[PDB]
């Protein structure tokens, strides 16, 4: 409703970075070599970044609009618009801290 009039940029704390994240990418896998579906804890997982199909989870139990907002019991995927995959972020939880190179070099 309100109209953006200023844009501020500042540092992001770990808890703020985790606030942006819909989940932790725990594995280097991307898509299955056969099904070509996303892997369960990888960089394209729908359980965190969002569904690939509109209002249709990954198993197919809920696949209509009236179910919008529902997270699937055995998928872990919210039925909603697939457009969220351009916007929803994940994160990587480092074992030891690493320095942001911008503020170093």
């Amino acid at each position: 409703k309100k109209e953006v009039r200023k844009v501020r940029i500042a540092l992001a704390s770990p808890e703020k970075i985790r606030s942006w994240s819909y989940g932790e990418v725990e594995k280097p896998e991307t898509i299955n070599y056969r099904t070509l579906k996303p892997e369960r804890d990888g960089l394209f997982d729908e359980r965190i970044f969002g569904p690939i199909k509109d209002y249709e989870c990954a198993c197919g139990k809920y696949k209509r609009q009236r179910f919008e907002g529902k997270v699937c019991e055995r998928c872990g995927v919210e039925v909603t618009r697939s457009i969220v995959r351009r916007y929803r972020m994940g994160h990587i939880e480092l074992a030891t801290p690493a320095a942001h190179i911008w503020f170093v070099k």
Binding site: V25, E26, K27, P28, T30, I31, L36, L43, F44, I92, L94, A95, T96, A98, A99, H100, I101, W102, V104, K105
Partner: protein
């Protein structure tokens, strides 16, 4: 990450950067749990820092990480923002636009100052969504989907739908642009008149402002969609409302060439 023609996959460099970071971070985790000696832990922590700042700014420190079989550095998050192809230059440098066309230009002296000659085919495509709606309102087709099937699958354009196109065009203006756009008069708004042929017909009095020459020059057409876009195209961009130079205040749409010759 998508498969293109031929079945082969095409992906973004950022994925392999993330993938190299996740691999090293996971190895550090199961090395801390195994209780590894410090020389090993220090090595994974070095490689971890070298994995993170490669995601951030690959190449800045150390040799850039590359894919097997190439010397090309992988594109980092900084290369996504910085540079000529970066996000901070993307909006400034302009874009390809929908609802636009192009054609060689022709003199069309019968035009009024506020008019241009638009080929019927080009108009039918430039205003296609508008034409679909008015084909429905005039009972030419049951609905918008049926009107689209008519235009796409017929090749026979009845006089009924040329009248329909004439009604959506009524009052509207298109933008005419000849490159290079050196001042604002390089873009001007005209009311389109449907014309036989394949060429845009350009009023001769605006040729000075465009620096237009009928020796093969081409111009672009753009249709402003919204009413705001139409209103400001008609009020402040119409050719007949921009007669004087913004640089000097002297007349810019003025008699020229044969016009002076006869008078």
């Amino acid at each position: 990450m998508v498969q293109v023609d031929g079945g082969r996959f095409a992906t973004s460099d950022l994925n392999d950067l993330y993938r190299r970071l996740i691999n090293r971070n996971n190895r550090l985790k199961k090395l801390l749990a195994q209780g590894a000696p410090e020389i090993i832990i220090r090595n994974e922590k070095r490689m971890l820092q070298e994995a993170v700042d490669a995601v951030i700014d690959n190449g800045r420190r150390g040799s850039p990480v590359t894919n097997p079989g190439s010397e090309r550095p992988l594109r980092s998050l900084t290369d996504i923002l910085s540079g000529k192809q970066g996000r901070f230059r993307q909006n400034l440098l302009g874009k390809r636009v929908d609802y636009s066309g192009r054609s060689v230009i022709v003199v069309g002296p019968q035009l009024k100052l506020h008019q241009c000659g638009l080929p019927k085919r080009m108009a039918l495509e430039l205003f296609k969504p508008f034409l679909l709606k008015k084909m429905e309102e005039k009972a030419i087709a049951p609905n918008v989907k049926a009107a689209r099937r008519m235009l796409e699958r017929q090749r026979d354009i009845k006089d009924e739908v040329w009248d329909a196109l004439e009604e959506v065009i009524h009052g509207k203006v298109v933008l005419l642009n000849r490159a290079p756009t050196l001042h604002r008069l390089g873009i001007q708004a005209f009311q389109p008149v449907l014309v036989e042929g394949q060429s845009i017909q350009l009023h001769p009095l605006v040729c000075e402002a465009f620096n237009a020459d009928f020796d093969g020059d081409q111009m672009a057409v753009h249709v402003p969609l919204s009413s705001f876009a139409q209103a400001e195209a008609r009020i402040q961009m119409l050719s007949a409302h921009n007669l004087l130079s913004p640089a000097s205040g002297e007349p810019l749409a003025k008699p020229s060439r044969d016009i002076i010759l006869g008078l």
